[PDB]
Amino acid sequence: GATMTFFKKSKISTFEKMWAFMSSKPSALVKNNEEGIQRTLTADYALLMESTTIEYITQRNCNLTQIGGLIDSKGYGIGTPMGSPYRDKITIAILQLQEEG
């Protein structure tokens, strides 16, 4: 996932330390989101993943709370082919859309 890739690419002692701890135990690892969902529903097993996904899950689950803000920095944009004029037009459109609220 993006989170674990960030953890291995991060230079922050806390992030790399927690990643090394969780990777150290093979029983504290999941390969799918719903695996961690079920594990958390079964027992205390915190899942760290894209904040949008966590928010959506909490909005869809009355048994799972949300804790922690935007600890890291990620974002979603629109890919543009190399040598294309669509980038600037798309940027102005999205900037004015978000500006209006």
């Binding site: 944009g77 629109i78 082919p81 190399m82 940027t91």
Partner: protein
């Protein structure tokens, strides 16, 4: 191929990147994590969500 698109260990790309590189898609509005590795392959737009 369902994936965010990433640089393989053979030096080749996959997913949205190739679709944008091969010029079979001129636009792709989707959840796309912005990384400089993927930035070099395909330039993103301004992040509509952080």
């Amino acid at each position: 191929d369902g994936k965010y698109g990433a640089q393989d260990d053979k030096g080749q790309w996959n997913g949205m990147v190739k679709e944008l590189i091969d010029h079979k898609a001129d636009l792709a509005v989707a959840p796309l994590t912005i990384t400089h590795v993927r930035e070099k392959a395909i330039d993103f737009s301004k992040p509509f969500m952080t």
